């Protein structure tokens, strides 16, 4: 019975060339009126996930 | 437990009986019941690379040649007349060790049919040579045509 | 294959009973209850093997004190005199000699008394 890969994880994460895990930051979709300009600018872009939770994520994506 | 017969009911009440409190009549703890982890049908087939097997066979034959345990016979015994006595005499003259392997081409039957009965002899077609068979016997006797066919097929 | 626990357990149980032979009550007839008191016996033997040192030292000291008091000198002063004279013989030797050679014991006591200092109360 071939292994099952979690739908959400493979849909909300990505693998880079060398094997690091990347994600996107939250608190951006809506209601950013009071947020100053530098807020979204810093809150934009990608970032490498913290190494603390790396082990769990790797298991999910692989299955 | 789930496949043996019977044992479909709770044997008695739960509280107030006072004896051992049980759930089913054919539980693994009862005598005559099922087994926790019993052997189940399975298959022992194994994968082995062709390169590995060929290298093993080549090494075995190379060692046999190094130790000088290979001999070539044009033919076992005069054809169209099986005779075990002549074959036994010829094998004794050739070698005196207990066990020996003889390989003969498929299209010939008289040699095998005459050499079948010897206790320490095993017959094998040249196309089915295998490491276990070569190792088991101490010496190997090759027919000329069989040897030629094997060498040609392998070198091709 | 199917294997039957025939010999493995019976070997250990035979040796346990053989070692346990000589007890009282069920403890010498029932295997299950036996080994508990086997453990207790081994622990007690371990403990008293060490306690033997103190017990024998106690007996030797008692005997030496009795002999010295009979010979009219205290045990503490006798040991002090022996230490001053620098004779290293052991309490067991003194005890055996006293039970065997009262003359030798008296000679040793006299030597110790001679070797004793002038005043035991001096601040030195």
């Amino acid at each position: 019975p071939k292994a099952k890969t979690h739908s959400g994880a493979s849909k909300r994460f990505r693998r880079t060339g060398t094997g690091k895990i990347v994600r996107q930051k939250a608190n951006r979709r809506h209601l950013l009126e009071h947020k100053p300009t530098k807020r979204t600018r810093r809150l934009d872009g990608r970032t490498t996930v913290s190494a603390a939770d790396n082990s769990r994520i790797n298991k999910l994506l692989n299955g | 437990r789930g496949e043996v017969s019977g044992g479909g009911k709770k044997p008695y009440r739960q509280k107030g009986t006072g004896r051992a409190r049980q759930g089913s009549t054919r539980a693994p703890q009862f005598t005559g019941g099922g087994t926790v982890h019993g052997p189940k049908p399975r298959d022992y087939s194994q994968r082995t690379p062709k390169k590995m097997i060929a290298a093993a066979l080549r090494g075995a034959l190379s060692d046999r040649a190094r130790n000088d345990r290979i001999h070539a016979v044009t033919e076992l015994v005069e054809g169209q007349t099986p005779s075990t006595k002549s074959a036994k005499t010829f094998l004794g003259t050739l070698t005196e060790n207990k066990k020996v392997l003889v390989v003969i081409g498929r299209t010939d039957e008289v040699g095998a049919k005459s050499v079948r009965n010897l206790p320490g002899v095993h017959v094998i077609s040249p196309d089915q040579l295998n490491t276990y068979d070569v190792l088991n016997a101490d010496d190997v006797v090759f027919s000329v045509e069989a040897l030629n066919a094997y060498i040609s097929a392998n070198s091709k | 294959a199917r294997v039957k626990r025939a010999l493995n357990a019976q070997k250990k149980r035979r040796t346990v009973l053989k070692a346990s032979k000589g007890y009282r009550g069920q403890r010498s007839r029932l295997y299950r209850k036996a080994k508990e008191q086997q453990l207790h016996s081994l622990t007690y033997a371990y403990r008293d093997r060490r306690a033997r040192k103190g017990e024998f030292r106690k007996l030797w000291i008692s005997r030496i004190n009795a002999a010295a008091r009979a010979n009219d000198i205290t045990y503490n002063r006798l040991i002090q005199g022996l230490k001053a004279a620098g004779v290293e013989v052991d309490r067991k030797n003194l005890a055996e000699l006293a039970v065997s050679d009262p003359a030798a014991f008296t000679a040793l006591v006299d030597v110790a008394r001679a070797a004793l200092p002038e005043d035991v109360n001096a601040p030195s």
Binding site: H6, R12, R23, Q24, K25, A26, R28 | - | -
Partner: protein
């Protein structure tokens, strides 16, 4: 522990798949130079024989390395650097 975890409380990736992709396979001019000392004509068949790219896939060459041997190149797509390198190496390259 009841709390919605990371895979539950983070946004999604940004975009779609575009199943109409048309990938090629990369070939390095430096590797070709290293593998073909004498030079000459090159093509998909001999490239596959040398085992540089998958046989059924589409072929495209890249010019990261340095070239010093005349060669005739036949492929499906080219990059500017590879084109200039081939031209300067005293050779010619054509596209189907």
């Amino acid at each position: 522990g009841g709390q919605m975890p990371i895979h539950m409380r983070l946004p999604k990736l940004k975009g779609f798949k575009n199943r109409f992709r048309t990938e090629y396979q990369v070939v390095n001019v430096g590797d070709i130079n290293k593998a073909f000392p004498q030079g000459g004509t090159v093509g998909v068949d001999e490239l596959v024989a040398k085992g540089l790219v998958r046989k059924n896939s589409l072929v495209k060459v890249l010019g990261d390395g340095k070239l010093t041997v005349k060669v005739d190149v036949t492929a499906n797509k080219f990059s500017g650097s590879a084109r200039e390198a081939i031209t300067a190496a005293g050779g010619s390259a054509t596209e189907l």
